[model samples]
Target: VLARIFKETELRKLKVLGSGVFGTVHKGVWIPEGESIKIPVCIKVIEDKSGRQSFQAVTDHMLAIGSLDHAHIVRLLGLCPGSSLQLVTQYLPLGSLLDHVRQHRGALGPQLLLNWGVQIAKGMYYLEEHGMVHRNLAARNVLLKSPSQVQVADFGVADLLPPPIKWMALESIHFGKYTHQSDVWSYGVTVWELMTFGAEPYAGLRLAEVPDLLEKGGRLAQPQICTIDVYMVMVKCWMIDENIRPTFKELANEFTRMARDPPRYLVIK
Candidate 1:
């Protein structure tokens, strides 16, 4: 269960990035990027999953990220096994979707939100088209590599379709398994999260309460503390039947239209 140095130590530096329920992410380095490395890389470490599991996670993530080359997706620079199991990913200078929402507050106008929505759809579409599903697509999970650009990260819940199994073998996708269809569901929720600018998901419901509520067609409320059209996107994503959800390509196209002519409700006026 040893995660030795996958690369030279001097090649990377350690800076506290952020923490989640599982572990923390630190900004690291990759020598090849050179001293001119304008952006940092993220190295996340988990607690429960270790040794082979950690190593496996890195390898698995590399497979998804390495294979998929999308402007909106996080760039995976292979794997880096150091003293602790770690993942190397493109750095987000401005931080995550949650940071932007809170930092800007009410200033997060719909037009800007629309632009972000389009980016998410593009990335999600990229994954879906390749038979992959990102189980986790929250605002925090969606990192902003640059203004008006996003890199959806954290593939722990991600499921790579069978055909993608080339260099590495994927974990089985059994009943209740994750799929592109499920990704559509997640994307809907992601749309809501982005629109809300990171409103709490399922706010007060207990973890177990979510399934039944979702079964009956419940959805996220608007951040305006009022009604919103964007919330509809989330409602559709959270649908109990995954089959009814829209594909990423469709979602992206719709967002493009929305960006062109945003709803009056979304207008910040």
Candidate 2:
């Protein structure tokens, strides 16, 4: 599949969205091919300038990500092959899910949270079906299209970015192994973040100690807002054995049912 290539002249940087070790993100405007009006977009400029081989690898990865089409997954609009490596994607009005959850905890009711879970599960399931493993699945990587809607983002850049120790599965942390099941484990951590209103996982533990704690079968405690059934789902995803983890499809269906009949899966004290 051919990806849209945005000329450097076609993009205008509006404002800085955020910046980090990986890169700086900008809220930008893009003029599509043969289009008169400019559309809002997100541009990420990679900080690292690696060798030719690394650039080729990143390009291939971006092309694969750009080819994906799904409602709950962010669409990669195109790329700007210029002095710096820039990736363009659809601009979501609301920012990261982590910030949103933390800022509006009171406004995010149980039903809304559950619906977001289902939406994320559905996105992950679609990626799983396409044989794509989102090595970095977490609340921080989830972008909100609106207060009640979200789409999974940053799928193709995980390998190039720094590792997320707290969100990684046991195998991924220990042996650098990443797979669908590893993504499932990360999804579990993401859901926990939602339940806890964006509390960092393994809050006080040293980074070096997380693997040891996991080896000893230690997991995050259930949030007060999470019910028994939902917590059980998280537990299943965090099982020591990857094979024991539920697939994203199963999780999607489970969350879908729970959302459809909230009383069956939720209770208030």
Candidate 3:
């Protein structure tokens, strides 16, 4: 599949959005001459200047990501297609799921949160069917178009995570292994994030201690806001044996069923 190539002059970089090991993100405006429309976009510039493995790897990864078109997944609009490539994806107006969870804890009712969960599950199910593994599944990686609309983002930079290592499956953390099951493990952590309104997972645990702890059958405690059934589905993803982990399809089915008769909260005095 061929990606849309953008002219250098048409893309005007506005301000630095964020920076990480993988790259720097810039808020941009696409201003094409003879066209009245100016579209907002996010431009991601690769950090590695040398034509090393990172550069080639990013080029290949973006090609795969750019071709994907899912309602609940961010879309790649255009790219530089150069030796050191830059990616332009549709700009999400409402920031990331992590930011939304942090700012609106009390406002996210069970039904609304369940809707977000189902959206993510459906996106993951699609990726799994296509043989793609979203190795990094976290609230921070989910971009929101509105209060209830979210699309998974940053699927190409899983290995670039700097710390906390809490979102990775046991095998991923220990042996650098990532698969569909690993993503399910990370999805469990993401579910915890949503229910808790973005609380850090394994809050105070060190990276070095994570593997040994999980190997001994340790798991994250249920989020205070999560009901028994919701937590039960999440727990199924945390099985130490990857073969036993529930697929995203199963999760989507479970969440879809729960959404039909969503969980209700009762106030106790």
Candidate 4:
């Protein structure tokens, strides 16, 4: 399906939901001419620097994700092209998984956590099948529609700094090589976020320290609430040898099986 480009005048009740160096996401209502009921949607803005270099750069990035359609992945509704580029998508009210996890914290049950894990994994699997890599898989990029429904958002923006530093694979951090396996490594970090109820991964570590630290068999300790079976899966994802890491398909299956019959907890290392 061809993505329809929306006019700026159609966006009603626009509110700045979030903003950063890359751009912003606006919470707004789309009101078509002669329509009584306005539809809710989120508009992602990519700041235009106004050079063919920057325009095509942003355009290329937008084209990469413009046609994606999946239940687990965020739907790209349309685009508003101009001085500042914008991409419209479905509105998710509950907000990012990072915010929700922090809000709920210890109040969330094991079943709920496992449910989110599966949802995120399924989203990544969809991306994997399509030959795309999220590169920046973290709790912040996973938005929750309702308490039970989650989808991966912020597709190409993962390369932007600060948040991805801790979640990125070593190869990605060093060589700028993002792949399906690198996404798996990031997913492992994301799982740690869920298990820890939104704790920052590698809290005390600096960006420069991460490379050397991870090189010598260092890794994030399992969250206090993390189960042995689940933590083991995370360990595999964090493996320096990316070739052996599990794919999103396999991770989704693992989470599904564990959710069905979660094993007893093992002693924390």
Best by lDDT: 2
lDDT of 3 at 175: 83
- C-alpha-based local distance difference test score of model 3: 0.78
Ordered by TM-score, highest first, the candidates read: 2, 3, 4, 1
* Model 1 Cα lDDT, one tens digit per residue, 1-269: 12223454434657877676455787876665345553456676544343444443345444554566678877555555444555566676788887788788557667778888888888878777776666666677788888767777775433322221110101112245556666666666666666666666777776656655544555556556223566666556655555776777777876787778765547454
Q: Model 2 over residues 126-211: C-alpha lDDT tens digits?
A: 88888678887899889998777899988867655444899999999889999999999999999999988899899899999999
Q: Write the per-residue lDDT of candidate 4 for residues 101-181, one digit (tens) a residue.
A: 899787776777787888889988887777667766788889887778889987765432223578889988888888889
Provide TM-scores for the models. Answer: 0.77, 0.90, 0.88, 0.88
TM-score of 1: 0.77
- Kindly give the stretch of ten consecutive residues in candidate 4 with the minimal lDDT sum: 260-269
Candidate 4 residue spans exceeding 4 A from truth: 33-37, 53-61, 158-163, 263-269
lDDT of 2: 0.84
**Cα lDDT, model 1, residue 134:** 67
Candidate number achieving the greatest TM-score relative to the actual structure: 2
- Residues 190-253, candidate 3: write the lDDT tens digits: 9889888889887788778877788888888977766778888888899988989998888888
**Local lDDT at 4 for model 1:** 24
